[PDB]
């Protein structure tokens, strides 16, 4: 309501893909998730759906943003604000608007907010090797991913002031809870190709099969029938949260490079700790003393991004994102200079 001018100007073109997320981070003083959350949740009408007040939402975005570590270069509140922004953008697109229901939009925006809450700047395999409290707690299986979702609901419902789900109906909340959990757990690295293969096989290929006829009225309702099913909506939710999470290579060049440094700094810090404590080196290529960030980003984009966003683009139609993916890939290539 009474947003200050810097933070208000920083959130001018939040609908657009081109959005200065670090200016918002600088404006908010490492509090971008609360300000960007309030606008987006209001723009979608999330507390109107959930039957929470505006005051319950402020308290909710505060306690979650508090649990995001400022010391983490990449995995902090500004990363979640970025992922929240990419999620909303995908929800706003026509394909996703005319496929998913209102409950899915709420699950997506809530999932994006919480998906890395209380991240220790360290990977799952580091915690499993180190014998961490959470690695013992989740039995070396989806350690971070389960901790995020679990804690996110411990903070939400456990206190009355933070509980945005308090006024819901038990049947609706049970669906929404299950949907959020699935979207948060779908971000795990080890399940990458399972969720990509499932998306292409059940959405892209059958949608491509249905375009053999073209744009018939009986055929369009069949295309509506098949995609909108409970199972196929879950797959689009898994694909949207996976794309939004790792959308930084599809950003404007400056933000791509800033996100590239942060995640790289974070892996160097782990690697420096791994050799210090006598741990086995899980990500040996990511050492500050041997890692080429431009070459490493090309490999990252080759392995994870190019097939995933191609599959996603064909579904949603993302000319701006894929043109950035071409420009950013070409920039990383051009930094060899040897």
Ligand X SMILES: Nc1nc(Cl)nc2c1ncn2Cc1cc(OCC(F)F)cc(OC(F)F)c1
Residue 248 and residue 260 in contact, taking contact as beta carbons nearer than 8 Å: yes
Which of the residues 7 through 26 are near Zn ion (CB under 5 A)?
Answer: none
Question: Applying CB under 6 A, which of residues 68, 300, 312, 315 lies at the interface with ligand X?
Answer: 300
Q: Report if residue 116 touches Zn ion, rule: CB under 5 A.
A: yes
Nearer to Mg ion, 189 or 261 (CB): 189
Question: Applying CB under 6 A, which of residues 65, 82, 188, 274 lies at the interface with ligand X?
Answer: 188
Residue 190 and residue 144 in contact, taking contact as beta carbons nearer than 8 Å: no
Helix (H) or strand (E) run with residue 210 in it: helix 205-210
Residue nearest to ligand X (CB): 192
Residue 83 and residue 216 in contact, taking contact as beta carbons nearer than 8 Å: no
The contact mask relative to ligand X for 247-286 (x = CB under 6 A, - = no) is -xx---------xx--x-----------------------
Nearer to ligand X, 168 or 186 (CB): 186
247 binds, among Zn ion, ligand X, Mg ion, none (CB under 5 to 8 A by kind): none
Stretch in the footprint of ligand X (CB under 6 A) among 12-20, 80-88, 188-196, 201-209: 188-196
Identify the CA nearest to 108 among candidates 83, 72, 133, 126: 83
Binding residues for Mg ion (CB under 5 A) = 116, 187
Residues designated catalytic: 75
DSSP structure class, residue 288 = T
115 is in an annotated binding site: yes
Q: Report if residue 69 touches ligand X, rule: CB under 6 A.
A: no
Q: Report if residue 304 touches ligand X, rule: CB under 6 A.
A: yes
Q: Report if residue 112 touches ligand X, rule: CB under 6 A.
A: no
Residue 109 and residue 60 in contact, taking contact as beta carbons nearer than 8 Å: no
Please list, in sequence order, all residues whose beta carbon lies within 8 angstroms of the beta carbon of residue 69, skipping any fewer than 6 positions away: 75, 76, 118, 119, 120, 121
Q: Report if residue 146 touches ligand X, rule: CB under 6 A.
A: no
79 is in an annotated binding site: yes
Q: At what angle do helices 21-28 and 32-44 cross, to 10 degrees?
A: 120
Nearer to Mg ion, 187 or 271 (CB): 187
Q: Report if residue 145 touches Zn ion, rule: CB under 5 A.
A: no
User: DSSP readout, 149-197?
Assistant: HHHHHHHHHHSTTT-TTTTS-HHHHHHHHHHHHHHHHTT-STTHHHHHH
Nearer to ligand X, 58 or 195 (CB): 195
Helix, coil or strand: residue 236: helix
CA–CA distance, 167 with 180 (Å, rounded to integer) = 17
Determine the distance from the C-alpha atom of residue 166 to the mean position of all C-alpha atoms in its chain, rounded to a whole number. Answer: 25
CA–CA distance, 112 with 317 (Å, rounded to integer) = 21
Q: Report if residue 65 touches Zn ion, rule: CB under 5 A.
A: no
Nearer to ligand X, 59 or 187 (CB): 187
Q: How far is the CB of 168 from ligand X (least distance, A)?
A: 29
Footprint of ligand X (CB under 6 A): 187-189, 192, 242, 246, 248-249, 259-260, 263, 296-297, 300, 304
Footprint of Zn ion (CB under 5 A): 116, 245
Q: What residues form the annotated binding site for a divalent metal cation?
A: 79, 115-116, 245
């Amino acid at each position: 309501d009474d947003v200050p001018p810097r933070i208000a100007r920083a959130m001018e073109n939040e609908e657009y893909w081109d959005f200065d997320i670090f200016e918002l981070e600088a404006a908010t003083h490492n509090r971008p998730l609360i300000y960007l959350g309030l606008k987006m949740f209001a723009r979608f009408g999330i507390c109107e759906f959930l039957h929470c007040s505006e005051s319950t939402l402020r308290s909710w975005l505060q306690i979650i943003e508090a649990n995001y570590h400022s010391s983490n270069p990449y995995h902090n509140s500004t990363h979640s604000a970025d992922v929240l922004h990419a999620t909303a953008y995908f929800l706003s697109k026509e394909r996703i608007k005319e496929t998913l229901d209102p409950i899915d939009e709420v699950a997506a925006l809530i999932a994006a907010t919480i998906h890395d809450v209380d991240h220790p700047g360290r990977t799952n395999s580091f915690l499993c090797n180190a014998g961490s409290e959470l690695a013992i707690l989740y039995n070396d299986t989806a350690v971070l991913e389960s901790h995020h979702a679990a804690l996110a609901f411990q903070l939400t419902t456990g206190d009355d002031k933070c509980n945005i789900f308090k006024n819901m109906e038990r049947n609706d909340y049970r669906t929404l809870r299950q949907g959020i959990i699935d979207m948060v757990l779908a971000t795990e690295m080890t399940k990458h190709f399972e969720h990509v293969n499932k998306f292409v096989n059940s959405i892209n290929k059958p949608l491509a099969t249905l375009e053999e006829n073209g744009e018939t009225d009986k055929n369009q309702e069949v295309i509506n029938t098949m995609l909108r099913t409970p199972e196929n909506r879950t797959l689009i939710k898994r694909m949207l949260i996976k794309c939004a999470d790792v959308s930084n290579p599809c950003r404007p060049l400056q933000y791509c490079i800033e996100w590239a440094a942060r995640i790289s700094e974070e892996y160097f810090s782990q690697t420096d700790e791994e050799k210090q404590q006598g741990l086995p080196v899980v990500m040996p290529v990511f050492d500050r003393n041997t890692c080429s960030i431009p070459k490493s980003q090309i490999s990252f984009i080759d392995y994870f991004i190019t097939d995933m966003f191609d599959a996603w683009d064909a579904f949603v139609d993302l000319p701006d994102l894929m043109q950035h993916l071409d420009n950013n890939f070409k920039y990383w290539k051009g930094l060899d200079e040897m």
